[PDB]
Amino acid sequence: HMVVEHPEFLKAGKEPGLQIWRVEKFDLVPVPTNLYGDFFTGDAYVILKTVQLRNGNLQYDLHYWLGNECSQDESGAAAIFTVQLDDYLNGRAVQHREVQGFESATFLGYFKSGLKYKKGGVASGFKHVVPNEVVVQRLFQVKG
Amino acid sequence: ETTALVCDNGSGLVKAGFAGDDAPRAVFPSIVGRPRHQGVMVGMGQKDSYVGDEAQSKRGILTLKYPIEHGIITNWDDMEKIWHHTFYNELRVAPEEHPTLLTEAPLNPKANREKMTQIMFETFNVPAMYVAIQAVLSLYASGRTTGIVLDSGDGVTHNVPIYEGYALPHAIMRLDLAGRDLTDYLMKILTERGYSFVTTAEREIVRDIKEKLCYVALDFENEMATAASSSSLEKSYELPDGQVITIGNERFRCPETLFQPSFIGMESAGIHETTYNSIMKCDIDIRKDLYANNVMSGGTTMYPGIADRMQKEITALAPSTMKIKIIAPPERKYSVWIGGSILASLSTFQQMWITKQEYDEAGPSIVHRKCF
Amino acid sequence: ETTALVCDNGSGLVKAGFAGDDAPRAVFPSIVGRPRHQGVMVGMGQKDSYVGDEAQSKRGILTLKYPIEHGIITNWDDMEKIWHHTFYNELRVAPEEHPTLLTEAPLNPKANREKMTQIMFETFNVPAMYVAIQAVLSLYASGRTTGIVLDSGDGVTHNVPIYEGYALPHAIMRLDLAGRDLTDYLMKILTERGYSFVTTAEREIVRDIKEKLCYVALDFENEMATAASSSSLEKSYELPDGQVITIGNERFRCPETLFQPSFIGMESAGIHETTYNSIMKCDIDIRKDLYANNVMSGGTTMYPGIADRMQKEITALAPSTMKIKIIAPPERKYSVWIGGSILASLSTFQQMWITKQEYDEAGPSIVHRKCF
Numbered sequence A: 001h002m003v004v005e006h007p008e009f010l011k012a013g014k015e016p017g018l019q020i021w022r023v024e025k026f027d028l029v030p031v032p033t034n035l036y037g038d039f040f041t042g043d044a045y046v047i048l049k050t051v052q053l054r055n056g057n058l059q060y061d062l063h064y065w066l067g068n069e070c071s072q073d074e075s076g077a078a079a080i081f082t083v084q085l086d087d088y089l090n091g092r093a094v095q096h097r098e099v100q101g102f103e104s105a106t107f108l109g110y111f112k113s114g115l116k117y118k119k120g121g122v123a124s125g126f127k128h129v130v131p132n133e134v135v136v137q138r139l140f141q142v143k144g
Numbered sequence B, C: 001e002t003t004a005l006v007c008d009n010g011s012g013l014v015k016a017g018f019a020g021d022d023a024p025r026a027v028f029p030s031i032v033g034r035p036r037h038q039g040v041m042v043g044m045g046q047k048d049s050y051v052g053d054e055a056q057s058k059r060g061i062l063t064l065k066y067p068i069e070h071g072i073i074t075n076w077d078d079m080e081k082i083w084h085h086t087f088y089n090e091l092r093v094a095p096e097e098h099p100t101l102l103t104e105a106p107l108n109p110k111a112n113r114e115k116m117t118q119i120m121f122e123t124f125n126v127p128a129m130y131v132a133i134q135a136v137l138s139l140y141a142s143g144r145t146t147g148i149v150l151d152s153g154d155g156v157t158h159n160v161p162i163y164e165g166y167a168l169p170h171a172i173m174r175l176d177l178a179g180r181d182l183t184d185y186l187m188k189i190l191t192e193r194g195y196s197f198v199t200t201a202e203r204e205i206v207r208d209i210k211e212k213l214c215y216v217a218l219d220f221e222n223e224m225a226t227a228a229s230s231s232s233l234e235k236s237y238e239l240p241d242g243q244v245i246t247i248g249n250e251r252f253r254c255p256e257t258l259f260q261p262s263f264i265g266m267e268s269a270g271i272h273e274t275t276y277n278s279i280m281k282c283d284i285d286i287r288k289d290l291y292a293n294n295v296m297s298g299g300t301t302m303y304p305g306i307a308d309r310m311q312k313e314i315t316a317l318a319p320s321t322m323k324i325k326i327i328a329p330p331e332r333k334y335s336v337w338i339g340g341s342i343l344a345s346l347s348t349f350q351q352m353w354i355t356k357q358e359y360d361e362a363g364p365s366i367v368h369r370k371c372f
């Protein structure tokens, strides 16, 4: 349960509300406020809601949302950032996995207007390699 | 500016490459070969110890030893030869410039972790280092934070429950049969056709036969009956000296040792109900998503039909009031490396490295307090 | 009222006789001799092939072939000649009214087992037959029921652990190194003193030299130093053409291939490691009496000093609390035949006989179900 000191995590879960982050190349960027409630189909998202209780404590709820066209690095980074944001907190949050088109009814409950999806997204941070590939065509003269 | 290295040290197949890649750059078997004859043509590049895939190439004239057995490093000097071959010959990099991420088996003893730290910082002189676990990187590569992982490689089979991104040590269960024992059983049951494979050189041939021509039968008895009656599943293989062997009912009998350990005289449980025995050891509330997330990882999950058979065998003895789904990505033989490559390339990982000066004023004991 | 026949068909010798007797009536080597020169004198008694001792008495003008090479049967017409000779010429009995007990080495290819049935009911027309494991007959001949048998003859050398009268199939080990390989190695190392032996007749002579003048050294390096420092270990042998040869350290180097197989270039371990790993693959509670009941069988265990060397090597490998007893009866050359002779003569045995009726309603597959 080693804590992390990512500088964007310092503004997370301090006042009752709802916070959205997008994964762009192994990093989180908070999407602006008027782009809330709608998502790209090829990106991964981290969703936080914090709720004030009657007795004074402040509960937390993490979701991580994966589109049907997101790559492996975006979904894996979303899962690891969800875990690390739970560890930055004192383990008081419950995590949920959200898939595009098969969301929970409570996930539909957070957004007032509803969910609407666009094509496209930010490109993946991976670069393509194949294991054990050589493409070589040379000729050597040995002489002496 | 510099790029981290990921090195997944398997018991029979070591993977290595650079962080931020979608595939490992190098996959080569973790063997050390030593010569068994005398080199009479002197001055023609004879070495006292051939390491890695080169030792796989001239495997006839060598004796082969595995430095890692059952997931745990036992012979340490050969493991230094594996790491030296990995850094200098294979990846062709200086270890002084690159941070290095390593992976370990679950329930690793502490002394092996400290000794891994000591040879990592003293012998090769890395500037940073980190140790991770096989199954949690498999689950991160699957895009999940909660699930059971059946990681079955060459040495051991591990069932690891992970809840909220952390493993549960009271329910991690180790079953000690894998593709090495399947290979040995296939050498046992090829003797009745008249083919003999005795030394370690042609164990690799039997491993190639097991990889190319094996499948998991959905039902065993009717498959045996159709194998006995007809000859529609008998197929041929070409040995590298030119002889052609043919294999019939042994094509599907050899994966069945995972579901029935009594085929090799092992009194333990099959791979399907040890996951049930692991999931009964967990808390009652968390079993709903733990049954739904059945992550298969490792190279011996790459048989055709193993997912449908695993679905049937879990669905038989779990209660009928719940749904079971088995997931099997096509990259599951490299998934630990994929999770490590995602983990090393993050923007929150630069503070989680174990730097050189922290090891200098901490010794080989800071690896427990940081890799946790 | 009919007397059953017991016919142990080894790789180098055939031991045949009647059930209930104490010694086998016919012992003769399993060879087929064919002429290789030009016959110039007409009439007389020239035959196209000679079998057994008649081939040994005329071996100067014959090429000799063994039907059995390393346990498996290669030539079946020659093996039919061997069976015809041992029925009609040696035992001089008609085989259509005597049930015939046959013996077989374990981990044999299955295709021999029905094929041995396929001659016996079709050509000779025996009323019944049975196939038994050689190691359990050797253990029964010692009066024991639990123990480990090292059976080493002319073709193969196998370790079989037996508990409660049944062999454990997951711990039987086979080593393809026996008396013919030691004979070939002795032909190889007699060229160092200048003696050339290339003919199959000369192979028979070197086999005789190996039987008369070889022993197992208790420690190899001290015995080599003793043979280097003096000539007290040298012995003389007279060839049948009157030539006298002298052998020194080669007396004990030729049994040492049993304990160090790397002399003839094999990666596999010695017979004592084979016995130790055969014991180690058994259950933990029955290892106490496997070390204490270690019988030896076959003609290749007839060297002087083999039992003391075996106890020395097993004692160094076993834990010190264990008690080691190597059991070497003087009748161990014919112990397979004695166990078969007692086992066939019992009044309670006449329902395990595979008779003609179930064979010709079941085909050549009854031997896989009634003979375990």
Ligand SMILES: Nc1ncnc2c1ncn2[C@@H]1O[C@H](COP(=O)(O)OP(=O)(O)OP(=O)(O)O)[C@@H](O)[C@H]1O
Pocket (backbone or CB within 6 Å): B009, B010, B011, B012, B013, B014, B070, B071, B151, B152, B153, B154, B155, B156, B157, B178, B179, B180, B207, B210, B211, B212, B297, B298, B299, B300, B301, B302, B303, B333
């Ligand atoms: N297609 C395949 N079918 C069957 N077996 C396979 C296949 N591909 C690989 N294997 C086997 O999988 C094993 C290697 O898998 P993997 O690299 O995941 O294991 P590892 O990391 O070496 O082992 P471990 O995790 O136990 O230390 C070998 O035994 C290999 O024979």
Ligand SMILES: Nc1ncnc2c1ncn2[C@@H]1O[C@H](COP(=O)(O)OP(=O)(O)O)[C@@H](O)[C@H]1O
Pocket (backbone or CB within 6 Å): C009, C010, C011, C012, C013, C014, C152, C153, C154, C155, C179, C180, C207, C210, C211, C212, C298, C299, C300, C302, C303, C333, C334
């Ligand atoms: N006194 C002896 N010393 C050493 N070896 C012997 C001796 N007698 C027989 N042998 C070897 O035993 C082998 C045959 O053993 P045995 O098991 O009786 O026959 P088979 O192997 O045909 O069943 C022969 O190859 C022979 O070389």
Ligand SMILES: [Ca+2]
Pocket (backbone or CB within 6 Å): A042, A043, A069, A070, A071, A074, A121, A122, A123, A124
């Ligand atoms: Ca994307």
Ligand SMILES: [Ca+2]
Pocket (backbone or CB within 6 Å): A086, A091, A092, A093, A094, A095, B164
């Ligand atoms: Ca939590």
Ligand SMILES: [Ca+2]
Pocket (backbone or CB within 6 Å): B009, B010, B011, B134, B153, B298, B336
């Ligand atoms: Ca692995």
Ligand SMILES: [Ca+2]
Pocket (backbone or CB within 6 Å): C010, C011, C134, C152, C153, C154, C298, C336
């Ligand atoms: Ca024999």
